[PDB]
PDB file of C-alpha atoms in Angstrom:
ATOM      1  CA  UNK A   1      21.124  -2.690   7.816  1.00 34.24           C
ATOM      2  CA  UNK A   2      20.013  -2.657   4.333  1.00 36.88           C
ATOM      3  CA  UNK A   3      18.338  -5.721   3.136  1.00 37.87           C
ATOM      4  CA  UNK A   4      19.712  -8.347   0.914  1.00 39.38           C
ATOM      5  CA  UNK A   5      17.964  -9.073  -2.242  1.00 39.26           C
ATOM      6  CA  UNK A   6      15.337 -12.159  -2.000  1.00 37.50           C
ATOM      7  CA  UNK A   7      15.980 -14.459  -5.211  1.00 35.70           C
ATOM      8  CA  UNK A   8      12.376 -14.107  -5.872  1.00 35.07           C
ATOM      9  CA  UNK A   9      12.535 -10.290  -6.606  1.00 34.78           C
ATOM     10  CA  UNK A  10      13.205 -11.573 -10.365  1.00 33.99           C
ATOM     11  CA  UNK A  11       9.271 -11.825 -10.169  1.00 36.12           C
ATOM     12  CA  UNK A  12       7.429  -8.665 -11.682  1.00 36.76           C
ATOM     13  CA  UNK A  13       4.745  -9.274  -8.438  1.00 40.63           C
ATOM     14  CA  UNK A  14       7.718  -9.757  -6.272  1.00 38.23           C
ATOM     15  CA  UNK A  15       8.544  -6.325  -4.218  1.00 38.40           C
ATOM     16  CA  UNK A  16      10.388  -8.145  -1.501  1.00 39.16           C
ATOM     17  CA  UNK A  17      10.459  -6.610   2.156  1.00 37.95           C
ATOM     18  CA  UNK A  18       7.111  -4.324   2.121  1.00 37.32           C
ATOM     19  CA  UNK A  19       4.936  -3.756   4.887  1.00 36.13           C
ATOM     20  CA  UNK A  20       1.302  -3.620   4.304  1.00 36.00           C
ATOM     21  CA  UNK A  21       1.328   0.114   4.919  1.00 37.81           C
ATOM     22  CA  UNK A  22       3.742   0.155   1.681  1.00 40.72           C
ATOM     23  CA  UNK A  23       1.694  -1.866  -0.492  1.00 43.75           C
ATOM     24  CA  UNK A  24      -1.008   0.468  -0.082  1.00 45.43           C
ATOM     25  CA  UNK A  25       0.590   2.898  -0.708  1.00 41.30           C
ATOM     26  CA  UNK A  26       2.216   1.059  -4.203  1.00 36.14           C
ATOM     27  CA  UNK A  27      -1.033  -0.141  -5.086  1.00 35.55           C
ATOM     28  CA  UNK A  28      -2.763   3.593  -4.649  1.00 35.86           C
ATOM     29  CA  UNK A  29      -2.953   4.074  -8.943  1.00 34.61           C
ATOM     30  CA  UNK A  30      -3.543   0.235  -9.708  1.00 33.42           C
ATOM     31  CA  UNK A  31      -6.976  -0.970 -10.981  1.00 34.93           C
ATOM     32  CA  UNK A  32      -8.793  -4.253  -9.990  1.00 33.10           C
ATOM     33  CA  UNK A  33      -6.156  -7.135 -10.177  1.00 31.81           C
ATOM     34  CA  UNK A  34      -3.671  -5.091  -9.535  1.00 31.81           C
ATOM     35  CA  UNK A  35      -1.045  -7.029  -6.536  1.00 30.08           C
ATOM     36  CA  UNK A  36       2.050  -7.741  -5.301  1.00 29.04           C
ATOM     37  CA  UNK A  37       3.388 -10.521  -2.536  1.00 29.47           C
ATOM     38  CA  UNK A  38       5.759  -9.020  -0.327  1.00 30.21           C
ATOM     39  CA  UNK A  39       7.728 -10.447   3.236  1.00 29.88           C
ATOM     40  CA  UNK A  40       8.433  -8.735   6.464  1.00 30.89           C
ATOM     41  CA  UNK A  41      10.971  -7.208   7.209  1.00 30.59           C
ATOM     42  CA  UNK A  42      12.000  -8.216  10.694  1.00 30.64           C
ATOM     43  CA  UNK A  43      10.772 -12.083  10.880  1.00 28.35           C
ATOM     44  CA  UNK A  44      11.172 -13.397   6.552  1.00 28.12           C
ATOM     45  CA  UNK A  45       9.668 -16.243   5.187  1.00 29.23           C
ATOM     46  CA  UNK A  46       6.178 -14.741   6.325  1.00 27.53           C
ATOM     47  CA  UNK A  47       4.596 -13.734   3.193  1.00 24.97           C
ATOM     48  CA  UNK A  48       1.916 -11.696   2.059  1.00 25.07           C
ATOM     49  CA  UNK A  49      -0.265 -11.120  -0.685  1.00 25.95           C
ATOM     50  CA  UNK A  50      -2.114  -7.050  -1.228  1.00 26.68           C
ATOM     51  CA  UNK A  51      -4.796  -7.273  -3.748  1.00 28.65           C
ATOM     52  CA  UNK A  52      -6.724  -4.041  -5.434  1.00 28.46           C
ATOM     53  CA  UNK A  53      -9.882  -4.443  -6.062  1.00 28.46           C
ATOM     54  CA  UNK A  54     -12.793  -1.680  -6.223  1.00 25.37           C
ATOM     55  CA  UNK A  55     -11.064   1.006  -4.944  1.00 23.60           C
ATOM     56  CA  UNK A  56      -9.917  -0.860  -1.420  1.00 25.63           C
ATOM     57  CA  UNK A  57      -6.442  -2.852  -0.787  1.00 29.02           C
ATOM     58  CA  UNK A  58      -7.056  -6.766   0.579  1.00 28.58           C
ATOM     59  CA  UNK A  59      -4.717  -8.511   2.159  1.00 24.90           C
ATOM     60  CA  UNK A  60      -3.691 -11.877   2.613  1.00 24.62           C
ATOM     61  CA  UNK A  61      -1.562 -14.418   4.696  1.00 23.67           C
ATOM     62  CA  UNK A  62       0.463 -16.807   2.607  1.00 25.42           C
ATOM     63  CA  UNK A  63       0.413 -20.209   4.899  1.00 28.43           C
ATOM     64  CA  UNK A  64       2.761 -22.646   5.070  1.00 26.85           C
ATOM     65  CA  UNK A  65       1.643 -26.309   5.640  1.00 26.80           C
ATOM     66  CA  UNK A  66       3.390 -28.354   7.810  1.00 28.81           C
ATOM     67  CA  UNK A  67       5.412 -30.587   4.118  1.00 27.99           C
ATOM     68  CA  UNK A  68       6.372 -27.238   3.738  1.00 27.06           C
ATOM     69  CA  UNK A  69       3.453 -26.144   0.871  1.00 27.53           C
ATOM     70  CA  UNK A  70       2.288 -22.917   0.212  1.00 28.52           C
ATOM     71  CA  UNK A  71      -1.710 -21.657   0.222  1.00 26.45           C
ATOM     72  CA  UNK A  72      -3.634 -18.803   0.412  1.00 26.32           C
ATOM     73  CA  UNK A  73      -6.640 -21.649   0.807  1.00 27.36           C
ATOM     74  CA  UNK A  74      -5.977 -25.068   2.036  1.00 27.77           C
ATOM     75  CA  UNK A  75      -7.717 -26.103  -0.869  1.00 28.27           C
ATOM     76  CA  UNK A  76      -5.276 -24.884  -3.296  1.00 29.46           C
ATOM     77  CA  UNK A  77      -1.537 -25.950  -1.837  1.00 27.55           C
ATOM     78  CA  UNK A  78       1.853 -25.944  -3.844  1.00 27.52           C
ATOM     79  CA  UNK A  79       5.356 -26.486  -3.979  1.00 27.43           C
ATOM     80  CA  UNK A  80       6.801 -22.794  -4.837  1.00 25.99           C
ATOM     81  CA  UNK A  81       5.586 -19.449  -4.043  1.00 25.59           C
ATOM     82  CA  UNK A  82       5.312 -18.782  -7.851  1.00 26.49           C
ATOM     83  CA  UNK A  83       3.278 -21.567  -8.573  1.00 27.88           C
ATOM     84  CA  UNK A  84       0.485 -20.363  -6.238  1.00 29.61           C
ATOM     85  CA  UNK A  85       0.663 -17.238  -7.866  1.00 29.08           C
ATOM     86  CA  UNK A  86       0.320 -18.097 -11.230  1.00 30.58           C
ATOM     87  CA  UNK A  87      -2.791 -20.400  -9.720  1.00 33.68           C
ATOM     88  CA  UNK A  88      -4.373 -17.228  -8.595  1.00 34.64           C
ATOM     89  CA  UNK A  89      -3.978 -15.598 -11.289  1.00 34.38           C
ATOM     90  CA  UNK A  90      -6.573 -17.295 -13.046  1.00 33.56           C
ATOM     91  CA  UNK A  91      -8.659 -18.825  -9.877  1.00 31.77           C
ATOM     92  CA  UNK A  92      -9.563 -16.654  -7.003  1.00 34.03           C
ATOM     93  CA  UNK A  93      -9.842 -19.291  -4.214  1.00 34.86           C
ATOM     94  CA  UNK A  94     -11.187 -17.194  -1.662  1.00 35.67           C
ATOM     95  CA  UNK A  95      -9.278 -13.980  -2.527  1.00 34.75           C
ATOM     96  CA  UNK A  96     -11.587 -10.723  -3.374  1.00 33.05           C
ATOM     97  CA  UNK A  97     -10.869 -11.497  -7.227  1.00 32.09           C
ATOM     98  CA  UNK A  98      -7.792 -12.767  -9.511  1.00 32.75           C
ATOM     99  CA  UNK A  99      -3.968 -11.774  -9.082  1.00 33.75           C
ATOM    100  CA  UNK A 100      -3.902 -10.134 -12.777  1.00 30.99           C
ATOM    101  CA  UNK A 101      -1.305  -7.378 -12.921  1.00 33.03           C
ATOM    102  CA  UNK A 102       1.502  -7.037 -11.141  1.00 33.37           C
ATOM    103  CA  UNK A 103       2.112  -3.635  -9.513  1.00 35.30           C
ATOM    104  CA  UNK A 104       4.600  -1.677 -11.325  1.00 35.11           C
ATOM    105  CA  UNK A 105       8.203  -1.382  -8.952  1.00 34.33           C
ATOM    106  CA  UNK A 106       9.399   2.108  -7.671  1.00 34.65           C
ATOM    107  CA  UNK A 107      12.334   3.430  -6.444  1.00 32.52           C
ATOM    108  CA  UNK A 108      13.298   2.506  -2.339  1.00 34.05           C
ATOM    109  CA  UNK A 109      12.258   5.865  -0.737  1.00 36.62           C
ATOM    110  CA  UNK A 110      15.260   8.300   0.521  1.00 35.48           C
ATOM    111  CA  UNK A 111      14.722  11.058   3.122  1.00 37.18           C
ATOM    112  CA  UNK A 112      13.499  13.230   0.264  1.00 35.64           C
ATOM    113  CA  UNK A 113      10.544  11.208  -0.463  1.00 37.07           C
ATOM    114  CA  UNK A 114       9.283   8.695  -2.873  1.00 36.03           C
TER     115      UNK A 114
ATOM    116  CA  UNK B   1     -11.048   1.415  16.156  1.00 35.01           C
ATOM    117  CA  UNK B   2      -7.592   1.210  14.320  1.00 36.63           C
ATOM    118  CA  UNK B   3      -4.660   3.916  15.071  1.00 33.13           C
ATOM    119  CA  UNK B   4      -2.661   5.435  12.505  1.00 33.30           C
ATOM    120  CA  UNK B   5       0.290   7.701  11.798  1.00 35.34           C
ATOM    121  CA  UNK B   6      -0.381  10.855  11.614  1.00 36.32           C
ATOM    122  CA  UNK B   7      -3.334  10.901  13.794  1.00 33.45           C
ATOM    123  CA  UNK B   8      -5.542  14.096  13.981  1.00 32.80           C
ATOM    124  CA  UNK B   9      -6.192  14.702  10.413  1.00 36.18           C
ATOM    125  CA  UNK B  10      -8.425  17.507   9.056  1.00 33.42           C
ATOM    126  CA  UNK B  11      -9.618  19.758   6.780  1.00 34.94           C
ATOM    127  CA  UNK B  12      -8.272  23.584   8.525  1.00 36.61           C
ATOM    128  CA  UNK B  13      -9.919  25.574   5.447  1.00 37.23           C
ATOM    129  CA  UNK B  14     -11.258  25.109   2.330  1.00 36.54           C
ATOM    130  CA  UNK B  15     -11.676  26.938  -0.811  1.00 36.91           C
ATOM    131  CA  UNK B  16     -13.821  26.110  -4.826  1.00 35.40           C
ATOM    132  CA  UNK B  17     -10.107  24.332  -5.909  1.00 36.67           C
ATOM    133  CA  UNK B  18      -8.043  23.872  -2.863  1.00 38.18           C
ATOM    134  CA  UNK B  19      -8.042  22.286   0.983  1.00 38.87           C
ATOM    135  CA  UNK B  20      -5.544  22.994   3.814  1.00 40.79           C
ATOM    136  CA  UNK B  21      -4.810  19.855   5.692  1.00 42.96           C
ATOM    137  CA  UNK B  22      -3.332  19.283   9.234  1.00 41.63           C
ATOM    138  CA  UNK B  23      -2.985  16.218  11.043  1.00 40.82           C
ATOM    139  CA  UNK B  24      -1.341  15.627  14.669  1.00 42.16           C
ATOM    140  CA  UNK B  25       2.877  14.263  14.509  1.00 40.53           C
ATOM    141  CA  UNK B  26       3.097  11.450  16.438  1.00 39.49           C
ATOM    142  CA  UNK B  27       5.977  11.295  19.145  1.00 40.91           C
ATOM    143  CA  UNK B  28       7.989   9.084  16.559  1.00 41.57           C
ATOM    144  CA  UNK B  29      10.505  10.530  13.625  1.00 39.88           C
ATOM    145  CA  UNK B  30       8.784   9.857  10.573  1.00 41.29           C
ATOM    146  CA  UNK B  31      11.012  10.934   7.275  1.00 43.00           C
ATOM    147  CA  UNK B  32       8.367  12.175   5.187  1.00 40.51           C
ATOM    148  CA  UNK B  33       4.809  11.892   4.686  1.00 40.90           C
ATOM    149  CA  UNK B  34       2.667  10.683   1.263  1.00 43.73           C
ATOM    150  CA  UNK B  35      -0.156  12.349   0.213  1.00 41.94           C
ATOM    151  CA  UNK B  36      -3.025  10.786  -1.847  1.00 45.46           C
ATOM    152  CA  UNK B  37      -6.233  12.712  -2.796  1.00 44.53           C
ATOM    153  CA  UNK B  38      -8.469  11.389  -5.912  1.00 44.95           C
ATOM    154  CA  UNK B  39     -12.502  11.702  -6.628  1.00 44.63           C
ATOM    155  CA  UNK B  40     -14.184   8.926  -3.285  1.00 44.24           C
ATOM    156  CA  UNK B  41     -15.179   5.825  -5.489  1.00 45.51           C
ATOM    157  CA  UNK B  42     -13.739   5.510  -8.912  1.00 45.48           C
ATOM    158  CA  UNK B  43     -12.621   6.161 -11.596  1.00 46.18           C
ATOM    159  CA  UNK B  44      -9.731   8.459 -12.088  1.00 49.87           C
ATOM    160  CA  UNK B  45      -5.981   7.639 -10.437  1.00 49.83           C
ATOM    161  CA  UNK B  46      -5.262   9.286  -7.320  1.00 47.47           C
ATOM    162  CA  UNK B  47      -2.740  12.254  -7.468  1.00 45.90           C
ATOM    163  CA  UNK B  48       0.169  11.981  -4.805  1.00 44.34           C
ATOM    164  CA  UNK B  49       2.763  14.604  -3.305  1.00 42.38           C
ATOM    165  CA  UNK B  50       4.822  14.541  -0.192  1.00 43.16           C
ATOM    166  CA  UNK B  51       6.164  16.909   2.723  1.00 39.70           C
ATOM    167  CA  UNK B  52       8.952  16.962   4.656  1.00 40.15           C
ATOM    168  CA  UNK B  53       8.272  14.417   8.405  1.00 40.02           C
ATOM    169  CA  UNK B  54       8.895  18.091  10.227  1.00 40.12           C
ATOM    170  CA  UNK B  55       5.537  19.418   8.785  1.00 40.65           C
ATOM    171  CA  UNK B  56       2.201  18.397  10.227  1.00 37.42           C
ATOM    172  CA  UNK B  57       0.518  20.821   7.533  1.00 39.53           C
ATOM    173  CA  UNK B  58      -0.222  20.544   3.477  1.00 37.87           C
ATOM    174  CA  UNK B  59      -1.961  22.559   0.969  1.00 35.63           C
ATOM    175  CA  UNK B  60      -3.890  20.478  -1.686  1.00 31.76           C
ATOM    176  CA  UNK B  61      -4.602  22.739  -4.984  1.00 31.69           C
ATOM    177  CA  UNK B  62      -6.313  21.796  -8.442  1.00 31.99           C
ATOM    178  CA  UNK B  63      -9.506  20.303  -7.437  1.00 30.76           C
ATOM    179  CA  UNK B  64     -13.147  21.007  -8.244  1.00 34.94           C
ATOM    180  CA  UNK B  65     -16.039  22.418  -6.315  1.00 33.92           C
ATOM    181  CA  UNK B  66     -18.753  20.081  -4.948  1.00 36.85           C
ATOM    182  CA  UNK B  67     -16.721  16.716  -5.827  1.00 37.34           C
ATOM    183  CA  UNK B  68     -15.905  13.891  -2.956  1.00 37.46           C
ATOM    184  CA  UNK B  69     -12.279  13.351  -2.229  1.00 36.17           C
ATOM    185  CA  UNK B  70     -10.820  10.597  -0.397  1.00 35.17           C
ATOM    186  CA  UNK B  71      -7.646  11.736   1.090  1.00 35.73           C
ATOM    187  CA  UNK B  72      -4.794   9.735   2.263  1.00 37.77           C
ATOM    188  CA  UNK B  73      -1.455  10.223   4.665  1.00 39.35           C
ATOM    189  CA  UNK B  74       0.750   7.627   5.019  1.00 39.14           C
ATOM    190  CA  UNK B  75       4.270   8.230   7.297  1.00 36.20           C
ATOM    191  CA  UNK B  76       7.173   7.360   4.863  1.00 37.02           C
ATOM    192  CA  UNK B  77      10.687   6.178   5.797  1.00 35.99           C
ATOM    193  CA  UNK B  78      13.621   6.556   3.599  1.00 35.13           C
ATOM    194  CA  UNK B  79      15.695   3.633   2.266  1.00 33.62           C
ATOM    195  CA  UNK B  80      12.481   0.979   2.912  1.00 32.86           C
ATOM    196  CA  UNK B  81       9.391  -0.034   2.710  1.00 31.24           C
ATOM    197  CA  UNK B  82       8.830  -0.970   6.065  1.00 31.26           C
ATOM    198  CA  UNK B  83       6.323   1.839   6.876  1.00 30.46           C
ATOM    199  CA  UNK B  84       5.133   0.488  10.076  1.00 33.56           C
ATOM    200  CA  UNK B  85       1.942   2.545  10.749  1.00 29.37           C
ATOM    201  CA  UNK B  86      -1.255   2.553   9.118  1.00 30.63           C
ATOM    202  CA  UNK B  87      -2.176   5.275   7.274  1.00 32.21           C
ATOM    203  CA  UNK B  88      -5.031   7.860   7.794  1.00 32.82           C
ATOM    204  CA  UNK B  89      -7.687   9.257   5.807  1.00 30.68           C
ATOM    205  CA  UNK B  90     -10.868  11.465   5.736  1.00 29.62           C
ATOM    206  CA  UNK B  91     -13.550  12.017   3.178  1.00 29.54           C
ATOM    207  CA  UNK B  92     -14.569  15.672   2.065  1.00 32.53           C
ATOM    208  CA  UNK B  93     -16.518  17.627  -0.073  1.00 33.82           C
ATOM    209  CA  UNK B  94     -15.675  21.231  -1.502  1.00 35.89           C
TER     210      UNK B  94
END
């Protein structure tokens, strides 16, 4: 029932198993740059990528080529999820603008609220 | 034209400082809903409260006369993230 924690969670940007509707939600006080990759839920290793930028929330399949490499734009493949991060952090390659601050983590919601 | 949970939302009254809010529950539990309201546009952070999944109302206080406010609902589920609806939101003017 409740999900194990991904190894990549050690990553600030990391927020594991978020649906898009969550990351708006988490990115709703950010400022442009402001992102965080998360998976699904109910089929993992499908990865995603919600960007702030002017006010509006972008988001963005992370593809996997067929040697197993990661890219937002086939231009721009790598070996490790945190690689292509830190490549978009400085490069846009077709996303809206630059991955440049992590969104801050909150606490898992309870039936109380969040 | 995308759906979204809660559906029908919409300003019921409005005063200078304040808007009363209702939206339609969908036949789904949701655990609570999120709030968002801030100024359309820029610049300031949005403010945020929530309400209990029962209520399909919510009473937004403290803002200013003749300002646009983009205002959010999002349907909330307790221990994840996995909010599986799109959220709603309307644009108004006191």
């Amino acid at each position: 029932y409740i999900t194990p924690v991904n190894s990549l969670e050690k990553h600030s940007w990391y927020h594991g198993p978020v649906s898009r509707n969550a990351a708006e939600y988490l990115l709703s006080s950010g400022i442009n740059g402001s992102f965080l990759v998360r998976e699904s839920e109910s089929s993992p290793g499908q990865r995603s990528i919600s960007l702030r930028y002017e006010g509006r929330v972008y988001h963005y399949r992370i593809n996997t080529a067929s040697d197993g490499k990661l890219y937002v734009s086939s231009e721009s493949r790598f070996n490790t999820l945190a690689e292509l991060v830190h490549h978009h952090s400085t490069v846009a390659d077709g996303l809206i603008t630059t991955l440049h601050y992590p969104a801050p983590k909150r606490n898992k919601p309870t039936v109380y609220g969040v | 034209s995308v759906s979204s949970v809660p559906t029908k939302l919409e300003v019921v009254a409005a005063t200078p400082t304040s808007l009363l809010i209702s939206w339609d529950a969908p036949a789904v539990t949701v655990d609570f809903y999120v709030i968002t309201y801030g100024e359309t546009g820029g610049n300031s952070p949005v403010q945020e409260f929530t309400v209990p999944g029962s209520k399909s109302t919510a009473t937004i206080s403290g803002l200013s006369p003749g300002v646009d406010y983009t205002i959010t609902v999002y349907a909330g589920y307790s221990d994840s993230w996995n909010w599986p609806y799109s959220p709603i939101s309307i644009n108004y003017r006191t």
